[PDB]
Amino acid sequence: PVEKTLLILKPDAVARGLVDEIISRFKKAGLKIVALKMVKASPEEIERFYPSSEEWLQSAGQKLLKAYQELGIDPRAKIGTDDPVEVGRIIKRNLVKYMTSGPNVVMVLKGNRAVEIVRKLVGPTSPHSAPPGTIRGDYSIDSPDLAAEEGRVVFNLVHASDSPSEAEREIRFWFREEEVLE
Amino acid sequence: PVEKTLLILKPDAVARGLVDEIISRFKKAGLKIVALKMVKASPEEIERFYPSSEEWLQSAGQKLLKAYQELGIDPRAKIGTDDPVEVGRIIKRNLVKYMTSGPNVVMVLKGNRAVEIVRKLVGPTSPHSAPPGTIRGDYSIDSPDLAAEEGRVVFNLVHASDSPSEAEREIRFWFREEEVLE
């Protein structure tokens, strides 16, 4: 039962005309788009889309605490807390603004090892350090320090399901059974 | 208040991987995509999307009849009737079968004089005489003789609204207010 993954083009990405450039890369690799739609998500939808586990909030929190040390930013002065879970809730809230600020395009990609292949093509979380050839490296120059100073998340173009399991959940979230056509 | 039009990539064109190539031509011209979805359409849906006016059936019918005549096909031996409206109903059934044969991708394109622009970019009905530069001349080599010989419609990649009037209708038909995003 061939593997599927969910990909979202975030609002900067759509507004900049990158839909077709990004679709072209998956196509050329041999992935089929088996669902596709442009949507305005409400904050509610984005809130339930992203996890709410403590583990996730916590692990997103440390990434940014680690960041704040390197730039010498006191997180207490910057966002009012140094608590990892609380900082996670602030990141999630930032995520919600950004994914809510314009239309998204959501697609399901299907092919041998879709989930890992899409992560590989998309590239790492920071575009400034994503290698050339990757979607994030070829189409963005944003960086986690700029994001930290401007009080936002990184504008890294897309979200890709980080696992088979997470993929089945995020797919079901966006698409009813008969919108996914194989 | 700026003009919009409805474009459908038909199953052949979705299957051949032309979604991104086609989206690229519109983005380059300055049109914005304001609605986009991949859909598996039912027979009844396509039945209702295409007109059922005698006027429309009649004219669809004459074009095929002219086609048969230049080919020296007897429409009575070929399809059982030579009545323009009855022929239009046969074409409509063939239209339905083809648009129903796999996923379509429906989009709404907004920009100055969108309907003509998109009609201009797409090219005339037969890809075989569509000039190079147009969507139908660059991506298809189909022709009405072959289609006739083979008891089917022309595989001409797309459907474009043929007037603003018809566009406001084809737009409502496929999208709720909330999906056509302003």
Curated annotation (Swiss-Prot), chains A, B:
One Pfam match: NDK
Cofactor requirements of the protein: Mg(2+)
Annotated residues for binding of ATP: K10, R119, T125, R136, N156
GO CC terms: cytoplasm
EC number: 2.7.4.6
UniProt-annotated location(s): Cytoplasm
Role summary: Major role in the synthesis of nucleoside triphosphates other than ATP. The ATP gamma phosphate is transferred to the NDP beta phosphate via a ping-pong mechanism, using a phosphorylated active-site intermediate.
Protein name per the record: Nucleoside diphosphate kinase
Taxonomic source organism: Pyrobaculum aerophilum (strain ATCC 51768 / DSM 7523 / JCM 9630 / CIP 104966 / NBRC 100827 / IM2)
Name of the gene: ndk
